[PDB]
Symmetry: C3
Subunit: 202 residues, 3 copies
């Protein structure tokens, strides 16, 4: 109403319009998904602006056969990620590091492993604060308003990611390329004109 006039509501703010809100755990899920989606969309966006490589084919740059092609990708970097001819980055090193670091972080967050700190943060609280609000924005501002803004950005980013998935399938081009083609000539470059062309299959 006042803070959420848009379609639907927030958990603790009313009744869901279509899919019933029956489990509180879903609330946590919705936030976690949302945070990842934000990092996803931004990432895809930024990377395509920096390298021209669409997000859905970037994985081919790093395989056990070769992962050196990513070494010089990052814009403005004072040096490549590894020297030329050193055979680095190595795919297995990247994979082992990701497994260890992200697995440990997720285990600490979800209660699989006991926390390394002794601050009493609660497992299952998607807004824990403390060390995870190091600049103290949640105590200097309005916590409930900030949570609503965060939830809205979560939902928007997830819907944008769904759009990215199906735009990739339907156009076989990057999302930034889709955006450029639309803004150049919106009447003649959109989903309906693409469908008239058969989406590349019909």
């Amino acid at each position: 109403a006042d803070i959420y006039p848009e379609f639907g509501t927030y958990p603790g703010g009313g009744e869901s319009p279509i899919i019933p809100f029956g489990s509180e755990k879903n609330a946590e899920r919705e936030v976690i998904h949302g945070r990842w989606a934000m990092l996803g969309v931004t990432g895809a966006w930024a990377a395509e602006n920096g390298t021209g490589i669409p997000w859905f084919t970037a994985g081919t740059l790093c395989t056990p056969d070769d992962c050196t092609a990513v070494a010089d990708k990052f814009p403005g970097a004072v040096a490549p990620l590894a020297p030329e001819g050193s055979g680095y980055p190595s795919f297995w090193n990247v994979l082992i590091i990701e497994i260890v670091l992200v697995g440990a972080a997720e285990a600490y967050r979800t209660g699989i492993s006991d926390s390394p700190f002794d601050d009493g943060l609660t497992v299952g609280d998607v807004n824990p604060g403390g060390r995870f609000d190091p600049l103290g924005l949640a105590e200097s501002g309005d916590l409930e308003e900030l949570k609503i803004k965060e939830l809205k950005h979560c939902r928007l980013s997830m819907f944008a990611w769904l759009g990215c998935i199906f735009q990739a399938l339907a156009t076989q081009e990057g999302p930034i390329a889709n955006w450029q083609s639309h803004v150049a000539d919106p009447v003649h470059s959109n989903v309906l004109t693409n469908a008239a062309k058969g989406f590349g299959f019909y």
Copy 2:
């Protein structure tokens, strides 16, 4: 049982067999969807019988570039929709008229804007009657029986529309063309023989 012996039941008539009936609003949704589906299937059907143009490609006839191709399509019409060479119908005129008329009707029905009449019709009642039963069939006949017949036609039309969607995807032909091909040789023209051919992709 007596009035609904077929699989399932109707809202207020028992328990849903598979997907639970939990919200009364879904009941309204089911009727509204259903009415559109009827107009949809009939439309596709009739248009393909009159013009030979399948429903899933008829949109390409009317674009901002050109919409005059629809002028002479309606069978038996004493004149085209607009004179030849006049540049009409115009896509923008069609779009604006649809937005105004259908938007106003939907707003009146859904309570977004107040009703233009003062008859006290209830917003949210999918069977309001009154001016929407001008011939008075609901009071001359059995209202509950007529509502059951309407609900059955709603469900049947919606399932037929789902069939139209997937038949279009699988055969790339109009639904009436599918019907003719099946009745001409049903053993050798059906979904299984189409699947053996790969649905045009395998």
Copy 3:
């Protein structure tokens, strides 16, 4: 916990993790589906090992035009299913027999038709026993443990069948051929390498 430490639980054993357990009928459904899935996966598996013909195209061997190609397929058989040149098996005979036998069995199981026996077996009980446990394993062992093992095999076989569906769509080869290609070179033959190749469409 003790008997079901894996993710999730069993009906009567706790709360469903994601999709709520609200109807007891679904429990029966899950078992019946599961049993068919086992027979499915096994069947596909065994048939591909015996004939080399993938499960998703085996139907083309038997149509009203011709069903003699199946006569000599079964490995080690002392004779073909019918004499050569006899025009058998006939598709219509196979179809009629399947309809009569499987339809009668399903009607007896589901209470559509009254049971031919007078043993008092309960319709709706997916673990009836009696004549359906002729070797008496359910009373010689632990019934609850055996039911848990059966439920686990049900769920595993259903997930494997879902894998078979999408592997057929993505690779256009038999599931056993997929297994051989993966085990021969798992780093270079998997879903990611197939995706880099476009799944045959991109």
